[PDB]
Design a protein around this ligand. Structure first.
Ligand SMILES: [Mg+2]
Ligand SMILES: [Mg+2]
Ligand SMILES: [Mg+2]
Ligand SMILES: [Mg+2]
Ligand SMILES: [Mg+2]
Ligand SMILES: [Mg+2]
Ligand SMILES: [Mg+2]
Ligand SMILES: [Mg+2]
Ligand SMILES: [Mg+2]
Ligand SMILES: [Mg+2]
Ligand SMILES: [Mg+2]
Ligand SMILES: [Mg+2]
Ligand SMILES: [Mg+2]
Ligand SMILES: [Mg+2]
Ligand SMILES: [Mg+2]
Ligand SMILES: [Mg+2]
Ligand SMILES: [Mg+2]
Ligand SMILES: [Mg+2]
Ligand SMILES: [Mg+2]
Ligand SMILES: [Mg+2]
Ligand SMILES: [Mg+2]
Ligand SMILES: [Mg+2]
Ligand SMILES: [Mg+2]
Ligand SMILES: [Mg+2]
Ligand SMILES: [Mg+2]
Ligand SMILES: [Mg+2]
Ligand SMILES: [Mg+2]
Ligand SMILES: [Mg+2]
Ligand SMILES: [Mg+2]
Ligand SMILES: [Mg+2]
Ligand SMILES: [Mg+2]
Ligand SMILES: [Mg+2]
Ligand SMILES: [Mg+2]
Ligand SMILES: [Mg+2]
Ligand SMILES: [Mg+2]
Ligand SMILES: [Mg+2]
Ligand SMILES: [Mg+2]
Ligand SMILES: [Zn+2]
Lengths: 50, 60, 122, 89
RNA sequence: AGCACAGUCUUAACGAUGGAUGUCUUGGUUCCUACAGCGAUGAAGGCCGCAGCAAAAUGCGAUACGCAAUGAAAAUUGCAGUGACUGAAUCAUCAGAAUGCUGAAUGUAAACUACACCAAUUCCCUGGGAAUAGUGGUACUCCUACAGAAAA
RNA sequence: UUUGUGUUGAAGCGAAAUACGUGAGUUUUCGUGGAACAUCUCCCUAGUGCAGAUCUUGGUGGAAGUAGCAACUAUUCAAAUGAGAACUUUGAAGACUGAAGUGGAGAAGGGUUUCUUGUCAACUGUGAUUGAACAAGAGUUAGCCGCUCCUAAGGGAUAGC
RNA sequence: UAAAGCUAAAUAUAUGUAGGAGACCGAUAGCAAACAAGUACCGUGAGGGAAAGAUGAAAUAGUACUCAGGAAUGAGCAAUU
RNA sequence: UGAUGUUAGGAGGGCAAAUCCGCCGAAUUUAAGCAUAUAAUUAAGCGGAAGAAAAGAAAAUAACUAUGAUUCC
């Protein structure tokens, strides 16, 4: 909705922040194996549950 | 780059003065990083640690 | 262990302790044997290998070659000698990694720290 | 009718029964009773029952950060006097 | 340049698809031994933040992937950087200092970063000189003192 | 417990044998494989032998290039871009919605789908240079619009019981 | 010798933490979880709950060069082992 | 003697449970059916502690040539 509370809007911002891919230079590390983030979300497919 | 043992003999007034000038320098570095001038982005770590040491001495 | 029951002889436990050792403990693991000449000058039998020492290679495809240690890699458990090199498929040059237990060292680089060790080790 | 008990009446189904809960963070706070169906927030206790072993272990003592308790171990074998410090040099 | 009908079924040789078999294991399981609670001096749990480039997990708290002190003791790295000729680069120990908003949650409320009353508050030199709308206190029940008032 | 094989190639697997046994099975050859494997000299021990249970988990068929890709009146000519245009863009036509509109503005619900630039591995059940897909950066400004205040049907508490 | 009171040891421990061990299991087995596992995901809610280990001694050897092709990719007299 | 007091100094509240203390309280099942009985002074529910808790120094046994606080094998 356009009408929101403070806390809910902060939660929406936090949940948008965590939907980004792994940094590219982090792949060039040694001792590392993580190719891609296994927790990725699309808006039309999985609901936040709020 | 500062060491704790060289600070133990200072007075409170000048300890606070050193903290203030460190804060000004860190603010300047952050302002410079906000613009696309990444020449000195590696100096922030040292200034942060220096702030921590000065506060440690003052609080003890 | 052999006769004290307060330490383990289990393959699982001490094979786990080897591969997750803290960086401070890894330098004691990376030790090499002394030559006969250095075994009379010093009473010691072996020392942890350090950077600017001089070594002789005793096992592997590069056995017999001598040189100076240029770098130590505590995470891969290997050392690098000055003229034992390699070509990548690009053509770029690198060093060949040698395990410190395949090596005997023939000349030390002494300083304040190693003096106090060689003194006690007598 | 046209909003019958299947597909039709599912379209009327907006609105919320539960929302986020202060004191446990789950979407389990009845907005009209004003009471959590998981932790029972308004009251002082925690609302846990012995017929659910699985639920009882999703939110026990060791499943969190243990912020203050974790620093309290290994004192029992050092047993220093409070205010002490190692010898200098 | 020439010669095999097509389909269906059978058998060999070489391949495709699929992930059994054998070998491996920083993981489980059971037994034995020792020790044992935390909290109004704010717990367990929840939320929000912190890195030069930084999503998760791990670690930390406006000093925020770490400060001081003690024991070792040259490196640490993807790039950029930082370090000695040993309070410094890194590891371990961990007693000093610091520890956001909440939560029994305790000034009144709560799908509010809403609203009260009382005391203005905090620094630096050694009585001056400064800064700041910032800080602290106020639940209920009960015990020992105390204070005055009231009945008798 | 005894006494044995292995980088001069173990276990496993595929095709076999002038081989042995009534039989369950032993044994050996060639190929692949790259690190372990037995004991029949005699004993001990068990989560110890599969064709089925509309058995459990995983993988694969004939059906089969088959059923099907039919609501919502309808498309055509030229040009641009591009490796490649019936379903991207431009111009010209022929038409629809017909103010009770696929026109404007809000609530509940969603949470960045909004904007600019780039771009096609997968998706957009035909194509695709398109896109609500993917990537990098941006964007929401109040004394007067609202909440915040009042009381309602009602909820939670205090004293006592 | 009731209608008041205190008291160590020999006993127990499917919890938490640390140490040792076995004629135990060996990735459809063993805890649900050998891995960012009470995680991803489902339900208004109380709750439900997975799949997923192995190149090589070394990648401080992870595929340079040429030709064809818009590319993907293929081939070689060319290349690591 | 009640009450009042932001008077001074203090205590209680929540989490955790394998072992421990107090209350409350079933049915499945067996009896080849079933009602007493059994399951069981158990599961679920509500309160309170410790490195152990509880119990404990005879208003106890015996009937002997007599033993002698509690606990456990
Ligand atoms: Mg809303
Ligand atoms: Mg939907
Ligand atoms: Mg119905
Ligand atoms: Mg309702
Ligand atoms: Mg024929
Ligand atoms: Mg206690
Ligand atoms: Mg927090
Ligand atoms: Mg010193
Ligand atoms: Mg030091
Ligand atoms: Mg409050
Ligand atoms: Mg309101
Ligand atoms: Mg009360
Ligand atoms: Mg065998
Ligand atoms: Mg091998
Ligand atoms: Mg069986
Ligand atoms: Mg079968
Ligand atoms: Mg057809
Ligand atoms: Mg289409
Ligand atoms: Mg019409
Ligand atoms: Mg018309
Ligand atoms: Mg009309
Ligand atoms: Mg758009
Ligand atoms: Mg676009
Ligand atoms: Mg298509
Ligand atoms: Mg997107
Ligand atoms: Mg108005
Ligand atoms: Mg009313
Ligand atoms: Mg008595
Ligand atoms: Mg007693
Ligand atoms: Mg074990
Ligand atoms: Mg498993
Ligand atoms: Mg019966
Ligand atoms: Mg019967
Ligand atoms: Mg019956
Ligand atoms: Mg019970
Ligand atoms: Mg209690
Ligand atoms: Mg007692
Ligand atoms: Zn709750």
């Amino acid at each position: 909705g356009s009408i929101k509370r403070f806390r809910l809007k902060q939660r929406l911002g936090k949940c948008r922040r965590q939907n980004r891919p792994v940094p590219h230079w982090y792949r060039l590390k040694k001792d590392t194996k993580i190719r891609y983030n296994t927790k990725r979300r699309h808006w039309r497919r999985t609901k936040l549950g709020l | 780059n500062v060491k704790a043992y060289e600070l133990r003999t200072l007075k409170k007034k000048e300890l606070l003065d050193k903290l203030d000038e460190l804060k000004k320098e860190l603010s300047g570095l952050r302002i410079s990083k906000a613009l696309g001038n990444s020449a000195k982005n590696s100096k922030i770590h040292g200034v942060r640690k220096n702030v921590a040491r000065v506060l440690t001495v003052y609080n003890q | 262990m052999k006769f004290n029951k307060q330490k383990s002889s289990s393959r699982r436990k001490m094979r786990k302790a080897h591969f997750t050792a803290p960086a401070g403990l890894r330098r004691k693991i990376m030790s090499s044997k002394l030559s006969k000449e250095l075994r009379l000058k010093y009473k010691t039998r072996s020392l942890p290998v350090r950077k600017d020492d001089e070594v002789l290679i005793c096992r592997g495809h590069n056995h017999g070659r001598e040189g100076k240690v240029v770098k130590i890699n505590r995470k891969r458990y290997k050392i690098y000698v000055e003229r034992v090199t390699r070509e990548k498929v690009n053509g770029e040059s690198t060093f060949i990694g040698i395990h410190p237990s395949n090596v005997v060292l023939t000349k030390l680089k002494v300083d304040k720290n190693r003096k106090k060790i060689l003194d006690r080790k007598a | 009718g046209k909003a019958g008990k299947g597909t039709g009446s599912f379209g009327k189904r907006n609105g919320k029964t539960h929302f986020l809960c202060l004191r446990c963070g789950k979407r389990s706070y009845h907005l009209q009773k004003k009471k959590c169906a998981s932790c029972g927030y308004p009251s002082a206790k925690k609302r846990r029952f012995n017929w659910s072993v699985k639920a009882k272990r999703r939110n026990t003592t060791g499943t969190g950060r243990c912020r203050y308790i974790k620093t309290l171990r290994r004192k029992l074998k050092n047993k220093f006097t409070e205010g002490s410090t190692p010898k200098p040099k």
